[PDB]
A paper describes a structure:
The NADPH-dependent FAD-containing oxidoreductase mycothiol disulfide reductase (Mtr) is known to reduce oxidized mycothiol disulfide (MSSM) to MSH, which is crucial to maintain the cellular redox balance. Mtr belongs to a group of NAD(P)H-dependent homodimeric oxidoreductases with a tightly bound flavin adenine dinucleotide (FAD) cofactor per subunit. The crystal structures of Mtr Re and Mtr Ms confirm that Mtr is a homodimer, as also supported by molecular-weight estimations during protein purification. Each monomer, composed of 458 and 461 residues in Mtr Re and Mtr Ms , respectively, belongs to the pyridine nucleotide-disulfide oxidoreductase (PNDO) superfamily and consists of three domains, namely a NAD(P)H-binding domain, a FAD-binding domain and a dimerization/interface domain. In addition, each subunit contains a catalytic redox-active disulfide/Cys pair that is responsible for the reduction of their respective and structurally unique disulfide-bonded substrates.
Two structures of Mtrs from homologous Actinobacteria are presented in this work; Mtr Ms from the M. tuberculosis model organism M. smegmatis and Mtr Re from R. erythropolis, a biocatalyst used for the bioremediation of toxic compounds. In addition, a strongly comparable A 465 nm/A 280 nm ratio for both proteins, as well as the yellow crystals obtained of Mtr Re and Mtr Ms , support the presence of FAD in both proteins, although FAD could not be built into the Mtr Ms structure due to its low resolution and lack of significant density. Together, these results demonstrate that the detailed structural features observed and described for the structure of Mtr Re are representative of both Mtr Re and Mtr Ms , as well as other Mtrs across species. In contrast to the previously reported asymmetric SAXS structure of Mtr, the crystallographic Mtr structures from M. smegmatis and R. erythropolis presented in this work display a symmetrical topology, as described for most homologous oxidoreductase structures.
Residue numbers in the entry:
A (entry chain A), B (entry chain B): 1 to 461
């Protein structure tokens, strides 16, 4: 019989768990699909890669705006796909040899359930891969999986999410997109920059109704002038009609396009473990119960982001991986000095046209929290940039508590959003105020971040 | 003869100093070139404006690397120039009435100069503009003035600096550029992106020998391949030969090109004021002497910016104007509440191909300060930005003191250098330690600012 000291499933951040410290144990990291979890092969890392191809293919489109003329000539879609996913296929087969070919660890193939605890209290793990093995401690990453509404299970039309549409063999002539959220808004810009009309069919009223209000506003009012935005219009079902896919719409007006897309949201993958038997709560989501220290209800076993966090992102996953790989040594005894995850302020970034990056709380949140607010919206304009790009619609909305000047969540759309929210992230996370950032440091001028200046300067303080 | 409560020489930042507070006094100003100083009319706002047109004209050139095809098609040089200077011609004569006619002030013309103090100790100021008036306090902005070596008085060939080469009627077919002193080599990229061979002729050894050593190195060793870089070889004399100008070199290398450029450096403007009579020392440079509080040697009179400071930039000029506009009221008595400028770290940004941004001290300087250092080189590469863009040549130099994990100057070159040094600028200003900044906050994954991540992570701590 085989038995390890520590086990892992997903390796989004689960490959970061293996460190020194242990260095002399038996470890298994049974990964089911490509080593890297959801991070490198399907989720965060593989995205944002096509984005630069799209950004060049968009700057050529907008070249006329800057006294420049440029032609698309030809689109090397095969070369773009091989440049993106020809980079992460051998590297994927690299973090796997880390824990297969190399000694004190051994990894197997897909499937990793849970089994009844042994009489001596150890954790049982089951592969449907003709094998069963127990261990002492097992941490679960198991990434996340995109979710398709029943409209696809009533037909069988070929569907694509973030998992596969980046490796589609051909560039469509006309594309359908459904979903208003994180996973769906990137491909709209990414593809439309490469010469395809996309047809957005959401389930609410507009795109991404779970972000900033005064950012949803001016993202709707630029997405309308590029993509076909159908509002509610709940897709009732689909029926293929030869070539060209046609979905049936809530108001009868059936919509047609070449290729399909879905990705309305994600769900964690804790259910597939049947942890109900091993005394672990999963709670419908797949989220798997944890706490501050990512500690579940069973001993020695833990979980990480996506599968468990309240943010399905890799930075929170890395902090949770930090506390996981650290807490298997500072035993569950001392709830102090056991090191807890940072589940305060986190940034989210959706790279579309234009980019968007948010952090902290929105106006609705702080108004529901009872504080009086000094919100400002700085136009990507009055800076010495703005006019250099003829940027008319880019904005950075910054929220701060009055009296003291405590910034509480920024929301920026326009050129350079992620590398502009980062000063605001730094100020947010560790006891920085607002004026401090404003007139306590130089802003190079005419550097891009100058917006923050007029974003912070004009506040109450 | 007249006497005012406040006088000014130049309104580069002089339009911002008179900022309420007084609101009910008599104020006089003196403009020689154009109301608005060098920022709005010649310096910061321009130069960097054409840069985005050039950067689009460079992304088209590099599109081939990313499975993209794009054409140079057309350069709308007249439309670019009118798009640039259609912003600073009416606004210059708009922000000027802001501080000249309305609502209780009077400003005069021509170059002004100090005159002998009156018997009651008041400052006399002389405009060659027929009229003369004195005052009680006078601030000197006088920006900075471009400097041409004697190399031009031995020829008479048409020469261009930052003042005018952006408003040249046509775009040359082959261009020569001289000057390596002040951070001038922006126009090299700006023009070469628009289809003209530029010929750099320095006076030292390489381009801009007053920057970081291991950055001058890897910037010269890409500028050699993109632009025609002629090393040292002091031109001295010149002789124009029709359209294409040919300079005669001491070593025989006659250089040829259509249009010329002259950006070897700038010098402060204290000499032309003959302020020597009104008791203010004009040091060797021609500069205006001040100190922490921007306090010169005569009372009530002050100076700010490049005309007096040791930094020829507009952000430091605006901070010095910030302290100035307040210190004209808090008399020299309380030197503790007379408030001082922040003259530690200052950021510089040179917008070329690619951009570059520096802050604090370089490695040589910090070695001259006696600290043992934990320098890191991030390489701008294995991060997800360079991983998606095949970014090979961008770099980030981070300097830090050992033991505690301090910091002594960041230096970043690449696509996004100005808007990435700003988190590092904020970290510099207020005692954040490398350890704190690294994993004490979230950094968006996958996103450009991840470059800072492994720049801080891969350290002694």
């Amino acid at each position: 019989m085989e038995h390890y000291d520590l086990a892992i499933i997903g390796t989004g951040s689960g490959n970061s768990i293996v460190d020194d410290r242990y260095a002399g144990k038996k470890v298994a990291i049974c990964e089911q699909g490509t080593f890297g979890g959801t991070c490198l092969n399907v989720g965060c890392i593989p995205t944002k890669m096509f984005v630069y191809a799209a950004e060049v293919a968009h700057s050529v489109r907008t070249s006329a705006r800057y006294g420049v003329d440029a032609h698309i000539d030809k689109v090397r879609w095969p070369d773009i796909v091989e440049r993106v996913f020809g980079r992460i296929d051998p590297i994927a087969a690299g973090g796997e040899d880390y824990r297969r070919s190399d000694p004190n660890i051994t990894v197997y193939s897909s499937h990793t359930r849970f089994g009844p605890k042994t009489d001596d209290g150890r954790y049982t793990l089951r592969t449907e891969s003709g094998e069963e093995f127990t261990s002492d401690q097992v941490v679960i990453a198991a990434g996340s999986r995109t979710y398709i509404p029943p409209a696809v299970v009533d037909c069988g039309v070929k569907y694509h999410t973030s998992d596969d549409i980046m490796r589609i063999p051909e560039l469509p002539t006309d594309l359908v997109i459904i979903g208003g959220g994180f996973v769906s808004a990137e491909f709209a810009h990414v593809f439309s920059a490469l010469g395809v009309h996309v047809t957005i069919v959401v389930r609410g009223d507009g795109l991404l109704t779970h972000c900033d209000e005064t950012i949803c506003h001016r993202f709707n009012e630029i997405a309308a002038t590029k993509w076909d935005i159908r509002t509610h219009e709940n897709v009732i079902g689909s029926h293929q009609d030869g070539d060209r896919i046609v979905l049936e719409l809530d108001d009868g007006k059936t919509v047609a396009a070449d290729t399909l897309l879905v990705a309305t949201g994600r769900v964690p993958n804790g259910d597939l473990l049947d942890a109900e038997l091993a005394g672990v709560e999963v709670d419908e989501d797949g989220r798997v119960i944890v706490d501050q220290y990512q500690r579940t209800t069973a001993r020695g076993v833990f979980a990480l982001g996506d599968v468990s966090s309240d943010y399905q992102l890799k930075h929170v996953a890395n902090h949770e991986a930090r506390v996981v790989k650290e807490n298997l040594l500072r035993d569950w005894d001392d709830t102090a000095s056991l090191v807890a995850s940072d589940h305060r302020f986190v940034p989210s970034a959706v790279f579309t046209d234009p980019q968007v990056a948010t952090v902290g709380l929105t106006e609705a949140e702080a108004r529901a929290a009872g504080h009086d607010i000094v919100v400002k919206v700085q136009n990507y304009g009055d800076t010495a940039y703005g006019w250099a790009m003829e940027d008319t619609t880019g904005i950075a909305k910054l929220i701060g508590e009055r009296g003291t000047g405590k910034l509480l969540g920024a929301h920026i759309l326009g050129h350079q959003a992620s590398s502009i929210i980062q000063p605001l992230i730094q100020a947010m996370s560790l006891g920085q105020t607002a004026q401090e950032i404003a007139r306590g440091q130089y802003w190079i001028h005419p550097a891009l971040p100058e917006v923050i200046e007029n974003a912070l300067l004009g506040l109450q303080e």
